[PDB]
Amino acid sequence: CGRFAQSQTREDYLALLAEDIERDIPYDPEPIGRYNVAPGTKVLLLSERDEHLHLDPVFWGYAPGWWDKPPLINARVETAATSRMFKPLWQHGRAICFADGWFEWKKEGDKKQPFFIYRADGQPIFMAAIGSTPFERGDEAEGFLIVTAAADQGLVDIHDRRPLVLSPEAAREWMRQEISGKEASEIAASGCVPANQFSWHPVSRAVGNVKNQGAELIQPVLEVLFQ
DNA sequence: GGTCGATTC
Numbered sequence: 135c136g137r138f139a140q141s142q143t144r145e146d147y148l149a150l151l152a153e154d155i156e157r158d159i160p161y162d163p164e165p166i167g168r169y170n171v172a173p174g175t176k177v178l179l180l181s182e183r184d185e186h187l188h189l190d191p192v193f194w195g196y197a198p199g200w201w202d203k204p205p206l207i208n209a210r211v212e213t214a215a216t217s218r219m220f221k222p223l224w225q226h227g228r229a230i231c232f233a234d235g236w237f238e239w240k241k242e243g244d245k246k247q248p249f250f251i252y253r254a255d256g257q258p259i260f261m262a263a264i265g266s267t268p269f270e271r272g273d274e275a276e277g278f279l280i281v282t283a284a285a286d287q288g289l290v291d292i293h294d295r296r297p298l299v300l301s302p303e304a305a306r307e308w309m310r311q312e313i314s315g316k317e318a319s320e321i322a323a324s325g326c327v328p329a330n331q332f333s334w335h336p337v338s339r340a341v342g343n344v345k346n347q348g349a350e351l352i353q354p355v356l357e358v359l360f361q
Numbered sequence: 362g363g364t365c366g367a368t369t370c
Binding site: 135136137138172173198200201203204206207208209210213217218219220221236237238239246248279282293294295341342343344345 | 362363364365366367368
């Protein structure tokens with residue numbers, strides 16, 4: 135995906151993740167407050183280094199000096215583990231981006247309708263990410279990407295790809311530095327949350343413009359002509 | 362060496 139919401143407190147996401155390792159993240163009850171998180175901004179990103187959990191603001195986008203196109207923001211789970219470009223990130227740069235849900239735009243002719251997608255059980259999500267370590271250096275070009283997967287079941291009607299969303303136990307496993315690239319692939323295949331676990335609904339077209347940042351951007355909208 | 366966000370006063 136290329137847009138999501140990360141609006142609640144750090145402890146809301148961290149309590150669900152339920153890490154048992156030392157946390158190097160100070161207590162902060164203030165909501166992050168972002169309802170329209172866009173590529174090319176710094177995003178709070180979870181990772182594990184020195185056996186400790188860290189939360190760093192990392193650029194969403196990845197463009198090495200040799201890359202002469204716009205920065206990539208997604209990496210396909212089908213190929214990233216063996217990609218010449220993505221393999222080092224898959225091996226050493228795994229991370230987690232937590233969120234309330236994400237946005238997708240459904241082409242309905244020459245008109246695109248945004249939907250907000252989120253867990254049917256009301257819980258937030260952990261999106262699998264890969265990126266350039268060390269994350270704490272604040273690199274302006276080599277940040278992170280959200281791993282994507284084929285849309286399954288109901289989601290393919292909205293759009294053909296989806297973020298790789300991991301259940302909390304798999305998000306913990308994903309971040310561990312001790313596991314191999316092949317093990318990470320097994321975690322991606324074992325912890326991916328199926329589409330029937332999500333709910334989705336149209337939202338205001340205003341979310342399309344990244345200048346718009348209100349909490350109403352995830353609120354649903356009834357779209358019948360006759361009302 | 363790749364991928365799917367909109368917007369463009």
